[PDB]
Amino acid sequence: GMSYIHETVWKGVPKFLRRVDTALKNIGINERLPYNVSLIRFSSWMGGDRDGNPRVTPEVTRDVCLLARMMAANLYIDQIEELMFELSMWRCNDELRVRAEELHSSSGSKVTKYYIEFWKQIPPNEPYRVILGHVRDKLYNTRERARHLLASGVSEISAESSFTSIEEFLEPLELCYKSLCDCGDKAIADGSLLDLLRQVFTFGLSLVKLDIRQESERHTDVIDAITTHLGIGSYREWSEDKRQEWLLSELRGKRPLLPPDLPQTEEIADVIGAFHVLAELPPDSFGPYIISMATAPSDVLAVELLQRECGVRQPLPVVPLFERLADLQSAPASVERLFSVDWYMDRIKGKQQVMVGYSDSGKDAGRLSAAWQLYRAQEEMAQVAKRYGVKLTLFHGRGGTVGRGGGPTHLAILSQPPDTINGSIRVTVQGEVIEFCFGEEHLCFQTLQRFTAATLEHGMHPPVSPKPEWRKLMDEMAVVATEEY
Amino acid sequence: RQEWLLSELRGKRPLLPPDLPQTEEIADVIGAFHVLAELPPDSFGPYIISMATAPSDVLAVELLQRECGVRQPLPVVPLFERLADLQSAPASVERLFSVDWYMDRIKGKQQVMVGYSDSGKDAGRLSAAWQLYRAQEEMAQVAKRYGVKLTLFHGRGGTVGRGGGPTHLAILSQPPDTINGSIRVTVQGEVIEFCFGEEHLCFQTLQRFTAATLEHGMHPPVSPKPEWRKLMDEMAVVATEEY
């Protein structure tokens, strides 16, 4: 998966954002799209989704997280020393001038004989090369520190010697950008520098943010082992309303719950060990924690508690994956229950993400009934979210085949109900589809354009909602189609 | 306190919250227990409670030990240093010995320290000397009833006022059938030089403790007559009031 991120996606994102800017010019907008606008992001399940895969261990997740951070450092280094050669102008800010003189002074005039270019100290009349030279050395530490953590588990190089945050990385680059602009050299700043700035906001220090996926029953397994070992009872046999009140009392409570004395299977161990690895790695390497075959709000609350009682100091957002027909029918109710408890509303802060599965729902019912309940699920969930003032982001688990929800990207976005995207959507690119959409450069440009254009048109020029007669007929054949299936 | 501590030691749910606010003193107590969990268990003897008064003092440390990650907990020894604490010392030992959880933990072995310094400072020399005789005597009786092997820890200094005196004489003044080949004694400060400053002396010190502990076992001293006890009990009250 990361091979495509190297060979077409890395340079393809700034190329496409370039075309978005010329499009903006030819409709009267005399301004570039801000480089902090992430029109297209890239996430990954590889090494993160472990549902049905016991071979995706807590060590495997740790590997792909650090390895991606190393790959990110490699690509940034190439862009930086390329930008080092390019930015040879002498006019600069007052702020850049002071910066370039600060680092020129604080840096002793040592040479690095194995540096191919800029092996001696850089003169202060090349200010952009002075700042980018410090960025370059800080990136070399970032690459090697990731290499050491990956091989052993510790590095000689400090975190203070490397880039530990996007903000630490962006500060020198945005200083150069504002400097070039203040000298009337905006046209230069919009070259390789703009492409790199856009690459930082798109890819960050991890290139891709990892998603974690585990099935709900594996979480209930661990929680049942806790209550059984503590003598509270059996979490598995409690009703869902009871489950909700118990976990909400434990999330509101300050006393720990998970005992280190806990007897664990290999599976109950894999669940806790995965949460442990999440607590060790930096938060900016992860996306949401996804719950396979989510059924009810306790599955969400179970993960929320397990995260905190495993020491995850900044918890991942919990995303339910409604994969089967019965789960999608009750999904607007499950979301309303979560939006109505004060603890969970304070946690999510007006933003909720829900995944809908196209593969397992088409297998539960027919293709007709799955696609129609998936329409209704998204439709009613967005209505629940709007009532509670929550911005709902849909995650569509589409495959390559039509049976698993596949099809032309702009056609699929047109099939989704009106007023359910609104500039926030996640879509899976599964396996062979990664080759289909990013195997060559013109394919990557095509894919980014379809998603961008379809999503944009869907927001301001939505499809028509079905007529009441159309709904009733659709509901009636869904019953007949599932029964036939 | 004994009810809550036992419900918590019996319960297997953790107690120590991570976001717990701590003073500098509270941070040192927990940090010490963390250090005890990091280093091998064979580097440590027991965890002694200064100013121990009641079983909740022993049970609290037993809990703070496990609630701080000491996977192999040290034996918790109370130090009865004042007169009142020594008067209620066999009572404190008894209720500990009557708790099923504590008896499962100590496994028939118990250590108790008695402080010759602060007890002489609290009462008189004569009173403290007598009460320490009784505390040792009644505690050994409590331990034998409950089938426990008691090991007394004598914290005596160099000077007579802090429990000092010739080794074979200090062992002889201890109640009969309270040593039985298991005793700990503090060698305090300058006494280390007095006893081990040269090979000659170390051989004497080792020989004194070994001989006097062996003789006290097989050939114990006499127990006090009932009139002697009654006289000591009344003289002790007059001594401490005068002191």
XYZ file of C-alpha atoms in Angstrom:
728
model
C 0.000 0.000 0.000
C 2.776 2.458 0.846
C 4.461 1.821 -2.518
C 1.667 3.770 -4.228
C 2.042 6.561 -1.659
C 5.655 6.812 -2.833
C 5.379 6.400 -6.573
C 2.299 8.472 -7.491
C 0.445 9.849 -4.464
C 3.324 11.843 -2.923
C 3.844 14.119 -5.937
C 0.262 13.734 -7.184
C -1.440 15.597 -4.329
C 0.393 18.928 -4.915
C -0.041 18.505 -8.680
C -3.812 18.156 -8.292
C -4.044 21.030 -5.803
C -2.221 22.997 -8.503
C -5.027 22.276 -10.979
C -7.617 23.191 -8.336
C -5.910 26.592 -8.162
C -5.953 27.263 -11.908
C -9.620 26.249 -11.890
C -10.216 28.818 -9.143
C -8.477 31.431 -11.301
C -10.670 30.705 -14.343
C -13.870 31.364 -12.369
C -12.696 34.702 -11.003
C -10.973 33.792 -7.717
C -7.682 35.732 -7.703
C -6.308 33.718 -4.798
C -4.669 30.337 -4.305
C -6.342 27.645 -2.247
C -4.779 27.934 1.238
C -2.022 25.378 1.740
C -3.490 24.397 5.132
C -6.639 23.196 3.330
C -6.526 19.382 3.249
C -8.707 18.711 0.223
C -7.540 15.073 0.117
C -6.166 13.071 3.039
C -4.842 9.512 3.071
C -5.350 6.997 5.872
C -4.441 3.332 6.202
C -5.832 0.136 7.701
C -2.706 -1.920 6.992
C -1.297 -2.984 10.344
C -4.294 -1.422 12.099
C -7.366 -3.451 11.189
C -7.089 -6.741 13.084
C -10.678 -8.050 12.953
C -10.454 -11.714 11.997
C -6.650 -11.393 11.664
C -4.782 -12.564 14.793
C -1.522 -12.017 12.879
C -2.032 -8.237 13.205
C -0.407 -8.093 16.637
C 0.431 -5.098 18.851
C 4.015 -5.331 17.554
C 2.810 -5.230 13.935
C 0.965 -1.964 14.599
C 4.085 -0.495 16.222
C 6.163 -1.462 13.169
C 4.023 0.169 10.473
C 3.653 3.326 12.575
C 7.398 3.891 12.939
C 8.185 2.635 9.428
C 5.737 5.135 7.927
C 7.277 7.910 10.027
C 10.650 6.914 8.559
C 9.283 6.898 4.999
C 7.793 10.335 5.659
C 11.220 11.558 6.777
C 12.847 10.117 3.643
C 10.457 11.920 1.286
C 10.697 15.220 3.171
C 14.504 15.080 3.078
C 14.497 14.772 -0.720
C 12.063 17.680 -1.057
C 14.031 19.795 1.427
C 17.519 19.472 -0.056
C 15.892 19.976 -3.453
C 14.281 23.140 -2.070
C 17.642 24.019 -0.490
C 19.212 24.377 -3.932
C 16.230 26.278 -5.335
C 15.690 29.039 -2.730
C 18.798 31.127 -3.407
C 17.172 34.568 -3.148
C 18.664 37.157 -0.793
C 15.646 39.363 0.000
C 13.837 38.251 3.142
C 11.681 39.296 6.087
C 12.834 41.096 9.162
C 11.783 37.934 11.018
C 13.673 35.650 8.621
C 16.719 37.939 8.695
C 16.866 37.743 12.498
C 16.277 33.996 12.355
C 18.977 33.401 9.729
C 21.447 35.483 11.761
C 20.485 33.698 14.991
C 21.211 30.230 13.596
C 24.278 31.319 11.601
C 25.704 32.702 14.851
C 24.670 29.784 17.075
C 25.968 27.262 14.512
C 29.726 26.831 14.624
C 31.524 26.928 11.292
C 31.953 23.152 11.160
C 31.978 21.296 7.850
C 30.394 17.941 7.020
C 32.702 16.275 4.505
C 30.144 13.615 3.501
C 27.432 16.141 2.597
C 27.140 16.235 -1.195
C 25.804 19.808 -1.283
C 26.084 22.540 1.355
C 28.851 20.761 3.244
C 30.306 23.960 4.728
C 28.541 26.591 6.809
C 25.948 28.616 4.908
C 26.419 32.383 4.542
C 23.756 34.601 6.149
C 23.122 36.406 2.847
C 21.428 33.188 1.678
C 18.733 33.291 4.388
C 16.403 30.626 2.983
C 19.311 28.192 2.712
C 20.234 28.859 6.351
C 16.771 27.971 7.672
C 16.270 25.023 5.311
C 19.730 23.731 6.218
C 18.664 23.511 9.857
C 15.396 21.876 8.755
C 17.451 19.383 6.748
C 19.624 18.325 9.699
C 16.535 18.077 11.923
C 14.989 15.772 9.314
C 18.107 13.579 9.214
C 17.714 13.063 12.963
C 14.005 12.311 12.510
C 14.785 9.631 9.915
C 17.525 8.001 11.997
C 15.577 8.176 15.264
C 12.725 6.304 13.583
C 15.273 3.800 12.259
C 16.618 3.175 15.770
C 13.188 2.802 17.382
C 12.239 0.374 14.605
C 15.351 -1.814 14.875
C 15.772 -1.864 18.658
C 13.389 0.213 20.768
C 15.459 3.232 21.796
C 17.525 5.927 20.098
C 20.590 7.938 21.024
C 19.093 10.981 19.279
C 16.785 13.113 21.415
C 13.236 14.131 20.590
C 14.491 17.708 20.988
C 16.910 16.999 18.111
C 14.165 15.910 15.682
C 10.680 16.865 14.490
C 8.081 15.591 16.958
C 5.096 17.624 15.715
C 3.680 19.122 12.532
C 3.828 22.559 14.165
C 7.576 22.219 14.805
C 8.031 21.332 11.114
C 5.698 23.991 9.692
C 7.190 26.956 11.577
C 10.356 27.290 9.426
C 8.522 26.593 6.157
C 5.748 29.118 6.804
C 8.406 31.653 7.803
C 10.074 31.227 4.410
C 6.719 31.468 2.627
C 5.692 34.697 4.349
C 9.205 36.062 3.776
C 9.223 35.475 0.011
C 5.767 37.055 -0.222
C 6.741 40.181 1.728
C 9.562 40.789 -0.787
C 7.204 40.663 -3.770
C 8.408 37.113 -4.540
C 5.060 35.365 -4.089
C 5.436 33.775 -7.532
C 8.557 32.010 -6.242
C 6.885 30.913 -2.993
C 4.144 29.248 -5.076
C 6.644 26.859 -6.672
C 8.362 23.965 -4.910
C 7.791 25.600 -1.513
C 4.000 25.593 -1.902
C 4.072 21.953 -3.030
C 6.006 20.986 0.100
C 3.753 22.989 2.427
C 0.716 21.279 0.903
C 2.475 17.931 1.344
C 2.952 18.608 5.064
C -0.729 19.379 5.670
C -1.750 16.368 3.566
C 0.709 13.753 4.836
C 2.269 15.027 8.050
C 5.049 13.274 9.914
C 3.358 9.853 9.520
C 2.479 10.066 5.785
C -0.781 8.231 6.563
C -2.832 8.089 9.755
C -3.560 4.541 10.885
C -7.043 3.283 11.736
C -7.539 0.530 14.323
C -10.367 -1.978 13.886
C -11.542 -4.724 16.240
C -14.903 -6.441 16.548
C -17.327 -5.575 19.337
C -17.480 -9.079 20.822
C -13.724 -9.049 21.443
C -14.270 -5.944 23.575
C -17.189 -7.498 25.462
C -14.967 -10.546 26.018
C -12.425 -8.433 27.924
C -15.048 -6.507 29.895
C -16.800 -9.738 30.862
C -13.458 -11.072 32.105
C -13.083 -7.916 34.215
C -16.497 -8.100 35.898
C -16.206 -11.865 36.400
C -12.741 -11.570 37.959
C -13.900 -8.654 40.149
C -17.207 -10.281 41.085
C -19.351 -7.444 39.748
C -21.209 -10.037 37.700
C -21.244 -10.936 34.006
C -21.104 -8.022 31.565
C -22.040 -10.390 28.732
C -25.410 -11.280 30.270
C -26.442 -7.715 31.157
C -29.041 -5.952 29.057
C -27.822 -3.111 26.867
C -29.489 -0.484 29.068
C -27.644 -1.952 32.057
C -24.366 -2.046 30.108
C -24.785 1.647 29.299
C -25.373 2.669 32.914
C -22.454 0.620 34.251
C -19.821 1.870 31.799
C -21.131 5.425 32.182
C -20.647 5.108 35.947
C -17.086 3.851 35.405
C -16.196 6.507 32.825
C -17.519 9.163 35.212
C -15.606 7.573 38.085
C -11.982 8.271 38.932
C -11.010 4.870 40.353
C -9.107 2.492 38.033
C -10.799 -0.707 36.923
C -8.445 -2.992 34.992
C -6.505 -5.161 37.459
C -3.005 -6.341 36.518
C -4.064 -9.637 38.157
C -6.497 -10.268 35.296
C -6.503 -13.795 33.805
C -6.374 -13.392 30.031
C -6.688 -15.668 27.026
C -4.549 -14.964 23.998
C -7.416 -12.940 22.504
C -8.195 -10.898 25.619
C -4.436 -10.283 25.722
C -4.325 -9.113 22.089
C -7.074 -6.582 22.820
C -5.285 -5.065 25.824
C -1.842 -5.221 24.218
C -3.181 -3.324 21.215
C -4.504 -0.615 23.544
C -1.111 -0.558 25.277
C 0.689 0.041 21.969
C -1.725 2.897 21.213
C -0.644 4.564 24.463
C 3.051 4.341 23.553
C 2.962 5.754 20.011
C 2.356 9.435 19.203
C -1.286 10.498 18.755
C -0.713 12.043 15.313
C -0.006 8.575 13.828
C -3.536 7.265 14.480
C -7.020 7.931 13.218
C -10.178 6.519 14.787
C -10.757 3.234 16.585
C -13.304 1.308 14.503
C -15.653 -1.311 15.994
C -16.593 -4.117 13.614
C -20.198 -5.345 13.741
C -21.201 -2.561 16.107
C -24.785 -3.005 17.304
C -25.538 -0.654 20.200
C -24.097 2.323 22.122
C -22.403 0.096 24.721
C -19.980 -1.139 22.053
C -18.864 2.474 21.624
C -18.754 3.103 25.379
C -16.875 -0.157 25.985
C -13.994 0.991 23.767
C -14.033 4.459 25.347
C -13.505 2.960 28.809
C -10.991 0.322 27.680
C -8.905 3.076 26.087
C -8.721 5.104 29.295
C -8.205 2.129 31.618
C -5.329 0.992 29.368
C -3.598 4.362 29.762
C -4.272 5.956 26.360
C -3.553 9.522 27.459
C -5.289 11.130 24.450
C -7.977 8.678 23.331
C -8.779 7.884 19.732
C -12.267 8.802 18.490
C -14.495 5.724 18.568
C -16.308 4.918 15.317
C -19.015 2.226 15.070
C -19.094 0.093 11.923
C -22.675 -1.000 11.195
C -22.119 -3.995 8.916
C -25.345 -6.039 9.084
C -28.911 -5.148 8.151
C -30.378 -5.265 11.667
C -27.556 -3.023 12.886
C -28.235 -0.391 10.216
C -31.960 -0.315 11.019
C -31.245 0.563 14.668
C -28.226 2.733 13.808
C -30.100 6.090 13.956
C -31.379 5.031 17.385
C -27.916 4.033 18.631
C -26.515 7.383 17.479
C -29.339 9.278 19.199
C -28.682 7.444 22.471
C -25.006 8.438 22.305
C -25.834 12.045 21.417
C -28.193 12.238 24.430
C -25.718 11.308 27.207
C -23.854 14.318 28.580
C -20.516 12.537 29.067
C -20.233 11.444 25.433
C -21.291 14.831 24.043
C -18.585 16.560 26.091
C -16.069 14.055 24.705
C -16.819 14.224 20.976
C -17.167 18.049 20.894
C -19.701 18.323 18.072
C -18.036 15.844 15.692
C -19.014 12.202 15.148
C -17.883 9.640 12.571
C -19.859 6.499 11.687
C -18.750 3.767 9.282
C -21.249 1.877 7.115
C -20.218 -1.470 5.652
C -21.087 -2.283 2.053
C -19.587 -5.793 2.060
C -21.295 -7.558 4.966
C -24.684 -5.849 4.529
C -25.006 -7.041 0.930
C -24.241 -10.518 2.292
C -26.831 -10.296 5.087
C -29.703 -9.195 2.846
C -29.733 -8.832 -0.937
C -27.949 -6.220 -3.001
C -31.184 -4.249 -3.398
C -32.110 -4.279 0.293
C -28.578 -3.530 1.499
C -28.223 -0.524 -0.814
C -31.623 0.807 0.263
C -31.122 0.428 4.019
C -27.658 1.935 3.574
C -29.411 4.893 1.938
C -31.850 5.143 4.846
C -29.164 4.662 7.512
C -27.079 7.583 6.229
C -30.247 9.626 5.693
C -31.701 9.293 9.189
C -28.332 9.403 10.983
C -27.612 12.813 9.450
C -31.039 13.966 10.651
C -30.238 12.817 14.194
C -26.862 14.572 14.026
C -28.381 17.849 12.808
C -30.934 17.814 15.638
C -28.155 17.520 18.237
C -25.871 19.966 16.417
C -23.272 17.297 15.578
C -21.233 17.257 12.360
C -21.518 13.673 11.115
C -18.791 12.173 8.918
C -19.699 9.021 7.005
C -17.079 6.329 6.386
C -18.063 4.184 3.397
C -16.545 0.701 3.362
C -16.726 0.101 -0.381
C -15.010 -2.694 -2.278
C -13.991 -3.243 -5.867
C -16.831 -5.504 -6.951
C -20.393 -4.250 -7.316
C -21.541 -6.853 -4.784
C -19.430 -5.152 -2.103
C -20.537 -1.630 -3.055
C -18.043 -0.958 -5.830
C -18.502 1.157 -8.908
C -17.454 4.460 -10.461
C -16.467 6.923 -7.766
C -18.568 9.830 -9.031
C -21.511 7.447 -9.484
C -21.264 6.185 -5.899
C -21.137 9.717 -4.476
C -24.226 10.519 -6.564
C -26.068 7.520 -5.074
C -25.657 8.792 -1.525
C -28.615 10.660 -0.025
C -28.667 14.459 -0.262
C -27.180 16.499 2.587
C -25.135 13.627 4.018
C -21.617 14.533 2.804
C -21.244 18.324 3.093
C -17.492 18.294 2.553
C -16.654 15.485 4.998
C -16.392 11.885 3.811
C -14.092 8.876 4.149
C -13.954 6.008 1.643
C -12.007 2.745 1.706
C -9.690 1.924 -1.191
C -9.417 -1.834 -0.751
C -6.597 -4.001 -2.082
C -6.631 -4.297 -5.867
C -8.533 -0.994 -6.076
C -5.380 0.758 -4.842
C -3.753 -0.358 -8.093
C -6.832 0.610 -10.130
C -6.827 4.179 -8.790
C -3.133 4.947 -8.206
C -1.075 2.547 -10.336
C 0.066 5.350 -12.651
C 0.187 9.133 -12.409
C -2.786 9.885 -14.682
C -4.847 7.412 -12.648
C -3.978 9.229 -9.414
C -4.887 12.581 -10.962
C -8.129 11.027 -12.211
C -9.034 9.548 -8.818
C -8.347 12.727 -6.837
C -10.409 14.712 -9.342
C -13.435 12.398 -9.256
C -13.620 12.424 -5.452
C -13.061 16.190 -5.240
C -15.514 17.129 -8.001
C -18.236 14.633 -7.035
C -18.101 15.583 -3.344
C -18.098 19.304 -4.163
C -21.059 19.030 -6.547
C -22.961 16.847 -4.063
C -22.766 19.580 -1.420
C -24.033 22.575 -3.398
C -25.996 20.746 -6.139
C -27.425 17.677 -4.399
C -29.396 14.862 -6.030
C -33.166 14.813 -5.722
C -34.745 13.122 -2.743
C -37.079 10.220 -3.578
C -40.800 10.794 -3.886
C -43.109 9.392 -1.167
C -44.424 6.818 -3.647
C -40.805 5.907 -4.420
C -39.991 5.365 -0.734
C -42.985 3.103 -0.070
C -42.250 0.962 -3.129
C -38.561 0.787 -2.188
C -39.462 -0.336 1.337
C -41.800 -3.021 -0.010
C -39.352 -4.610 -2.463
C -36.580 -4.521 0.143
C -38.709 -6.940 2.179
C -39.399 -9.069 -0.902
C -35.761 -8.978 -2.046
C -34.326 -9.975 1.340
C -36.907 -12.739 1.717
C -35.952 -14.007 -1.730
C -32.263 -13.771 -0.783
C -10.005 1.647 58.912
C -9.433 -2.067 59.516
C -12.782 -2.828 57.870
C -12.075 -0.770 54.747
C -8.447 -1.869 54.357
C -9.443 -5.533 54.573
C -12.245 -5.037 52.040
C -9.646 -3.465 49.733
C -6.926 -6.074 50.286
C -9.510 -8.803 49.700
C -10.913 -7.007 46.666
C -8.873 -7.396 43.493
C -9.883 -4.076 41.901
C -7.085 -1.465 41.824
C -7.346 1.599 44.043
C -4.499 4.039 43.320
C -5.736 6.574 40.727
C -3.202 7.914 38.211
C -4.302 11.570 38.396
C -3.992 11.589 42.203
C -2.809 14.957 43.600
C 0.318 14.568 45.719
C 2.268 16.702 48.159
C 6.046 16.418 48.314
C 5.630 14.089 51.306
C 3.023 11.900 49.594
C 5.207 11.769 46.470
C 8.155 10.480 48.513
C 6.106 7.691 50.114
C 4.786 6.432 46.772
C 8.120 6.937 45.015
C 9.811 4.806 47.667
C 7.361 1.981 46.959
C 8.054 2.360 43.234
C 11.782 1.976 43.933
C 10.990 -1.150 45.964
C 9.174 -2.636 42.960
C 12.054 -1.931 40.560
C 14.901 -3.548 42.527
C 15.251 -7.275 43.224
C 13.418 -8.547 46.320
C 16.584 -10.055 47.836
C 18.037 -6.560 48.361
C 15.357 -5.690 50.943
C 14.544 -6.803 54.445
C 11.260 -5.673 55.979
C 9.226 -2.453 55.805
C 9.255 -1.047 59.340
C 6.482 1.279 60.541
C 7.828 3.970 62.831
C 5.343 5.086 65.505
C 3.122 2.051 64.956
C 0.056 2.066 67.207
C -2.699 -0.161 65.809
C -3.260 -2.832 63.124
C -4.519 -0.245 60.621
C -0.917 0.999 60.510
C 0.311 -2.431 59.389
C -2.593 -3.042 57.008
C -2.217 0.362 55.328
C 1.375 -0.375 54.309
C 0.319 -3.846 53.164
C -2.170 -2.124 50.837
C 0.047 0.773 49.731
C 2.626 -1.879 48.832
C 0.360 -3.776 46.442
C -1.334 -0.603 45.181
C 2.146 0.624 44.135
C 3.270 -2.414 42.126
C 5.450 -4.263 44.651
C 4.974 -7.664 43.024
C 6.767 -9.445 45.895
C 5.847 -7.435 49.004
C 8.229 -7.006 51.907
C 7.168 -8.189 55.374
C 5.583 -5.308 57.276
C 6.999 -4.876 60.790
C 5.444 -2.465 63.319
C 7.761 -0.495 65.593
C 6.117 0.100 68.981
C 8.148 3.017 70.339
C 5.996 4.713 72.996
C 4.509 3.465 76.250
C 0.852 3.390 75.186
C 1.743 1.666 71.911
C 3.638 -0.997 73.865
C 0.718 -1.459 76.267
C -1.670 -2.169 73.369
C 1.010 -4.087 71.438
C -0.191 -7.666 72.174
C -3.741 -6.521 71.422
C -2.559 -5.118 68.080
C -0.732 -8.368 67.307
C -3.747 -10.472 68.307
C -6.343 -8.862 66.017
C -3.877 -9.032 63.123
C -3.429 -12.740 63.881
C -7.226 -13.201 63.904
C -7.723 -11.885 60.342
C -7.802 -14.653 57.742
C -6.206 -12.533 55.006
C -3.253 -11.460 57.164
C -2.601 -15.014 58.371
C -2.568 -16.173 54.744
C 0.005 -13.468 53.973
C 2.516 -13.850 56.813
C 2.446 -17.682 56.643
C 3.230 -18.363 60.297
C 6.122 -15.874 60.500
C 5.901 -12.459 62.163
C 8.432 -9.777 63.071
C 7.839 -6.995 65.609
C 10.254 -4.198 66.526
C 10.443 -2.588 69.971
C 12.086 0.801 70.409
C 14.344 1.192 73.430
C 15.058 4.853 72.588
C 11.695 6.620 72.322
C 10.124 4.426 75.026
C 12.702 5.491 77.602
C 12.086 9.078 76.490
C 8.297 8.733 76.833
C 8.170 7.105 80.271
C 11.139 6.566 82.575
C 14.055 4.214 82.113
C 12.595 1.827 84.697
C 9.077 2.036 83.252
C 10.122 1.613 79.613
C 12.409 -1.278 80.569
C 9.526 -3.033 82.335
C 6.851 -2.402 79.695
C 9.176 -3.713 76.981
C 9.589 -6.881 79.063
C 5.814 -7.322 79.174
C 5.236 -6.438 75.512
C 7.800 -9.076 74.520
C 6.248 -11.577 76.925
C 2.578 -11.157 76.031
C 3.261 -10.878 72.287
C 5.123 -14.202 72.346
C 2.134 -15.754 74.121
C -0.256 -14.350 71.493
C 1.943 -15.697 68.693
C 2.231 -19.178 70.219
C -1.546 -19.389 70.672
C -1.993 -18.507 66.981
C 0.785 -20.866 65.847
C 3.061 -18.045 64.648
C 6.845 -17.850 65.010
C 7.532 -14.359 66.364
C 10.886 -12.666 65.742
C 11.560 -9.641 67.930
C 13.554 -6.687 66.594
C 15.385 -4.910 69.421
C 16.244 -1.329 68.555
C 18.789 -0.565 71.278
C 21.567 2.015 71.113
C 24.961 2.306 72.729
C 23.975 4.197 75.863
C 22.087 2.651 78.775
C 19.358 5.270 78.362
C 18.619 4.002 74.836
C 18.744 0.302 75.713
C 22.507 -0.216 75.680
C 24.637 -2.563 77.728
C 26.819 -5.671 77.449
C 25.361 -7.975 74.813
C 25.114 -11.121 76.952
C 23.521 -9.032 79.723
C 20.933 -7.377 77.467
C 19.926 -10.783 76.089
C 19.676 -12.123 79.652
C 17.242 -9.382 80.727
C 14.799 -10.453 77.948
C 11.791 -12.575 78.906
C 12.223 -16.357 78.784
C 11.085 -18.232 75.677
C 10.814 -15.124 73.495
C 14.027 -15.575 71.459
C 14.272 -19.271 70.525
C 17.027 -18.768 67.970
C 15.483 -15.847 66.064
C 16.393 -12.277 67.045
C 17.354 -9.007 65.357
C 19.332 -6.241 67.089
C 20.286 -2.784 65.835
C 23.989 -1.946 65.912
C 23.692 1.834 65.994
C 26.282 4.316 64.735
C 29.314 4.396 67.017
C 28.466 0.877 68.226
C 29.516 -0.413 64.787
C 33.069 0.726 65.551
C 32.878 -0.572 69.137
C 31.965 -4.054 67.876
C 33.655 -4.386 64.462
C 36.517 -1.869 64.487
C 39.057 -4.704 64.375
C 39.124 -8.468 63.758
C 39.591 -9.076 67.495
C 36.342 -7.229 68.226
C 34.239 -8.761 65.440
C 35.108 -12.227 66.740
C 34.009 -11.158 70.223
C 30.768 -9.567 69.005
C 29.861 -12.596 66.881
C 30.691 -14.922 69.771
C 28.712 -12.898 72.321
C 25.497 -12.824 70.278
C 25.762 -16.479 69.234
C 26.507 -17.762 72.750
C 23.979 -15.600 74.608
C 21.228 -16.390 72.086
C 21.945 -20.127 72.336
C 22.030 -20.148 76.150
C 18.828 -18.093 76.480
C 17.120 -20.748 74.348
C 18.017 -24.023 76.057
C 18.737 -22.574 79.537
C 16.299 -19.656 79.905
C 16.328 -17.191 82.809
C 13.645 -17.307 85.500
C 10.190 -15.827 85.108
C 9.217 -13.177 87.679
C 7.305 -14.144 90.794
C 3.747 -12.741 90.993
C 4.718 -10.382 93.825
C 7.652 -9.152 91.726
C 5.321 -8.351 88.821
C 2.867 -6.497 91.048
C 5.708 -4.478 92.580
C 7.131 -3.702 89.129
C 3.701 -2.658 87.848
C 3.162 -0.174 90.691
C 6.755 1.088 90.681
C 6.476 1.692 86.931
C 3.466 3.978 87.424
C 5.285 5.975 90.105
C 8.444 6.121 87.977
C 6.695 7.534 84.901
C 4.679 10.028 86.938
C 7.874 11.254 88.607
C 9.702 11.322 85.263
